[PDB]
């Protein structure tokens, strides 16, 4: 008789969404097991026929054989996900009828999934929103695609300034976020923490300009995207994904910036010991070492402020001593309240999680910022009551290679003299330390300073910085 | 023997701070029975050592007589309240120290303290900081000191603007909201959500140049402020009151308006049954009943807004069908964060907060935004769970008499032309129901449409509304 298993060998199940999400997995490494067995080359594995023999015999082999399928699950911590969504999963419906829920969590050093939320009820739903459904992560794209790449390309640094004047998109439409056109200029944390728009924007249209290869990052996180070239891109238009794969991009922020791939499989043995499968790590830096880090260092004041979310306050009554382990997370919210995300991590562990409904009607405008941050505070509680030091007590902390730059706050760059139309300028002021990932630091002031602005813009700024 | 008892007449003791407290108010009482018993005239009254007779004489009478003090406490929620401080104080802790503590839960309908916190712990320090300790209340002067009137007298309604501008104290000095000099018009909503001290400032100010009979209001409600003419009066400058007399003023608000004296004695007996105390109710309309009910909107959304407080946010994850009573509340902060208070009620109950230190040195900027916010959330959970309908699932709603204007958003007053130096003006825009307590309700837009505000002020406003 065949077997899964938690990760420390206890027996799931022989052969509710654990059982049917490591089993799907399982088949699918006894498929490549078998067509590698019976020597069918990759030309043979195209025919659809032939597909469609092989995974049923790989279905067939678990069945019948004896294979010993050992997960990456954790028994309790998985037990207490379920728990917490049976009891507090009510706390999603938000007048929008029956809320829906996908979460994952992982091990930042290892991406092994310690156990999951695949939906509200099962035996209702069928639905895996863990690991199958695949929507939009709206603005949780932005430290990953936009911000984190222009940090570690030296492009920005922590104190940064950003435009988030009003702009259009290039059809004419303006940049909206909830119902503001936008703005003034504002530094790097306070785009974060509100999740502004248009300085995302404008971001990824420098990254355009610069030529940075923005799908080798993506694509070495596992992403796939088939269209680079959409403005909205960084506010994850044209980006869908599922759960557990979002979570490993922020996996890879916890981690220092190295990848490590998901996985809910780490093994599979015959009954006799054959290896039929292994997980192999091939671990990745996939943004430097200093980028990551000054990366953690914003995404802690994303969940401080408490601007796009209560989690803090939420976990703070729930478990005041868990809410003082180092949490940093963003926050995603889709154009029409279709989705919403809250992505989670301490040093030691990631936990993403989406809410929204399976035919994509639109979810309330609160539904984000304060009930899936609710049932997230329930969730992390109940994962921690499971197994009191899995999340830990380690701080992130800004890696050595870091470069601290002493920068105006107005320009986010160092103090100078700059040309504004006439009076070559003497400019002075309020400072602050900046981080950057290059090797130089800030650069001077210059009139351009911010990321982003039209000529309208700038005049308007500089005129304001003046004064 | 004399006892003390809870309000059910369950013993509290035969003659920590519910003894104290009790005891101290019962023996003024015996104190008027037994100087009018033995005919002193006020005169005889006045002399200091008559005086100190009579009080020895009423601590002995008590002591060895046999009389029955009926408190207004309620055992089971005094109880929880003790044990919650017991556990959950040390969350009032905020690095400056161990801070104290004082709380008041107070019957909107009767005056009644069913139960109260005195401090962090009596062993360790006896000051009560419920009935004796007077701090200045800070900005939950404001809608009882402020809006409140201004509203009462027809001088204000609910979507009223007021200058948030920059404008200085008579001695020169800017009036500062934390470390902000000012912004521009708002609504009276945004002022008391956020606090802001300017609007307050301006509208103490019209109510000064109406002549309004201020000080009229706060007597009826008991408090003591020796000097109405102070600018920072409405900021709680040049008031200080204890938690339990500041708490009656929240329940005249909660209460449509009507006060009912605070108090925790209802009866004092002989043993024979002769009545030496018996409280007297005296209900007071202080606000009319269409001014309470727009403010208890308005303070509806001071917690729901979540900007000064993450109370809500705290109480949703301790006991989300508790939240979602019909809360309404303000905060306190003092200019040197030295005191902070929040005061919350629901149609049934009022529960009065301050946390500080004894020797009024600075608490952090977030000890009312946070600590205190979650504590007290604690602190509401505990008083629930001990007496499940005490809260109560009424809802405060707009009395009858309330007059509804339709308003410009911009002006908060009736659209129609206006004179902008030149171009008489038709003034148009978006527009909204706003709340008024007088007979006619808003009037039309005057250049001057907002609460206070200089010539360069409107100037500014006009030019924007214009465009
Ligand atoms: B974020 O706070 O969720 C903001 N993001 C968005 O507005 C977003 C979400 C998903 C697709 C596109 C889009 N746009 O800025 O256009
Ligand atoms: B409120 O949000 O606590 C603002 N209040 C104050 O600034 C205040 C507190 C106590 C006395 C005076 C004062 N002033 O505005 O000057
Ligand atoms: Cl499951
Ligand atoms: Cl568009
Ligand atoms: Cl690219
Ligand atoms: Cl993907
Ligand atoms: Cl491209
Ligand atoms: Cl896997
Ligand atoms: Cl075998
Ligand atoms: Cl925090
Ligand atoms: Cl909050
Ligand atoms: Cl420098
Ligand atoms: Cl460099
Ligand atoms: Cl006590
Ligand atoms: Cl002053
Ligand atoms: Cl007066
Ligand atoms: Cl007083
Ligand atoms: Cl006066
Ligand atoms: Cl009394
Ligand atoms: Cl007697
Ligand atoms: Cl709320
Ligand atoms: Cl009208
Ligand atoms: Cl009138
Ligand atoms: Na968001
Ligand atoms: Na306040």
Chains 1, 2 share one sequence.
Do not use: C
């Amino acid at each position: 008789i065949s077997e899964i298993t938690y990760s420390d060998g206890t027996v799931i199940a022989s052969i509710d969404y654990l059982y049917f999400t490591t089993l799907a997995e399982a088949q699918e490494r006894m498929y490549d097991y078998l067509a590698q067995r019976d020597n069918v080359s990759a030309k043979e594995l195209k025919n659809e026929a032939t597909q469609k023999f092989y995974r049923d015999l790989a279905a067939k082999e678990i069945e019948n054989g004896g294979y010993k399928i050992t997960t990456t699950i954790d028994q309790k911590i998985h037990s207490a996900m379920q728990s917490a969504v049976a009891d507090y999963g009510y706390l999603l419906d938000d007048g929008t009828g029956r809320v829906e829920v996908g979460n994952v969590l992982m091990d930042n050093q290892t991406g092994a999934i310690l156990g999951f939320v695949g939906g509200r009820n099962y035996q209702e739903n069928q639905n895996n929103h863990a690991f199958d459904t695949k929507r939009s992560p709206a603005s949780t794209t932005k430290p990953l695609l936009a911000y984190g790449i222009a940090i570690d390309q030296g492009l920005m640094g922590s104190e940064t300034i950003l435009s988030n004047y009003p702009t259009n998109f290039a059809n004419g439409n303006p940049i909206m976020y909830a119902n503001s056109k936008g703005t003034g200029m504002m530094t790097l944390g306070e785009a974060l923490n509100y999740s502004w728009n248009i300085p995302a924007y404008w971001t990824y249209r420098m990254l355009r300009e610069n030529g940075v290869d923005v799908k080798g990052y993506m694509e070495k996180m596992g992403y796939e995207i088939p269209e680079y070239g959409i403005e909205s891109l960084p506010m994850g238009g044209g980006i869908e994904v599922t759960v557990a794969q979002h979570t490993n991009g922020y996996q890879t922020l916890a981690n220092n910036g190295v990848y490590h791939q998901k996985h809910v499989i780490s093994k599979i043995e015959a009954a006799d010991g054959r290896v039929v499968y292994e997980y192999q790590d091939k671990p990745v830096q996939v943004y430097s070492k200093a980028t990551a880090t000054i990366m953690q260092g914003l995404l802690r004041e994303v969940l401080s402020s408490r601007v796009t979310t209560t989690f803090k306050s939420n976990l703070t009554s729930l478990n005041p001593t868990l809410a003082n382990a180092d949490w940093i997370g963003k926050t995603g919210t889709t154009g029409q309240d279709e989705n919403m995300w809250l992505m989670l991590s301490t040093p030691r562990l990631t936990l993403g999680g989406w809410i929204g409904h399976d035919d994509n009607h639109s979810l309330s405008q609160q539904a984000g910022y304060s009930n899936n941050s609710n049932y997230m505070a329930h969730l992390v509680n109940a994962i921690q009551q499971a197994s009191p030091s899995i999340w830990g007590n380690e701080r992130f902390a800004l890696d050595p290679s870091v470069v601290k730059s002493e920068v105006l706050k107005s320009t986010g760059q160092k103090p100078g003299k700059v040309s504004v139309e006439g009076k070559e300028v003497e400019v002075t002021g309020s400072t602050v330390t900046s981080y950057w990932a290059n090797k130089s630091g800030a650069p001077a002031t210059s009139y351009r300073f911010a990321i982003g602005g039209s000529d309208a813009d700038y005049q308007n700024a500089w005129s304001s910085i003046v004064g």
